[PDB]
Design a protein around this ligand. Structure first.
Ligand code: 4KR
Length: 159
């Protein structure tokens, strides 16, 4: 796994928009989106967010993330964490999160990174835990079927 990163480009949209494999996955990484995902929805997120970044290995875009909140000197909140299905479990998210932590520190002088994870996303909860994030609160949300879900709000200090 020889990973690199760069800002997301328009030519990456179709690939990245293909990452969420079902309604549940889309909900976990972009709860405001509507299934099916599309390049227009991805581009709209990019435009209203900051720091949209891809991870690349062996000439393939395998991961994407951005910030949905950014507060200089304070914190950033990581969003839209998406990984290519073939590349899941291989360290892409772990890699990209480290890149995004550096970017929060360097660009925003953030002291903290926030990550919110829906309860059903065990893989996410476990990975963020491995990376040092701690749970702080649980908020009530609703899924696309109007069912109640628990949004676990986590954070991690950045020096
Ligand atoms: C790390 C990730 O993929 O988080 C996905 C997410 C987003 C996201 O759209 O990026 N959020 C918001 O927007 C907030 N409601 C939180 S709810 C969780």
């Amino acid at each position: 796994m020889q990973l690199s990163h760069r800002p997301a480009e328009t030519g990456d949209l179709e690939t990245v928009a293909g990452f969420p494999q079902d309604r549940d996955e889309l909900f976990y990484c972009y709860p405001k989106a509507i299934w099916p995902f599309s390049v227009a929805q991805l581009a709209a997120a990019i435009a209203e967010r900051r720091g949209s970044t891809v991870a690349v290995h062996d000439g393939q875009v395998l991961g994407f993330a951005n910030f949905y909140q950014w507060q200089h000197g304070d914190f950033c909140a990581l969003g839209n964490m998406m990984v290519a299905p073939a590349a899941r479990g291989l360290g892409v998210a772990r890699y990209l999160i480290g890149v995004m932590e550096n970017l929060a520190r360097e660009q925003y002088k953030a002291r903290l990174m926030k990550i919110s994870c829906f309860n059903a996303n065990a893989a996410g909860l476990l990975l963020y835990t491995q990376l040092g994030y701690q749970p702080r609160a649980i908020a009530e949300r609703h899924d696309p079927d109007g069912r109640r879900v628990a949004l676990i709000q986590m954070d991690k200090p950045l020096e």
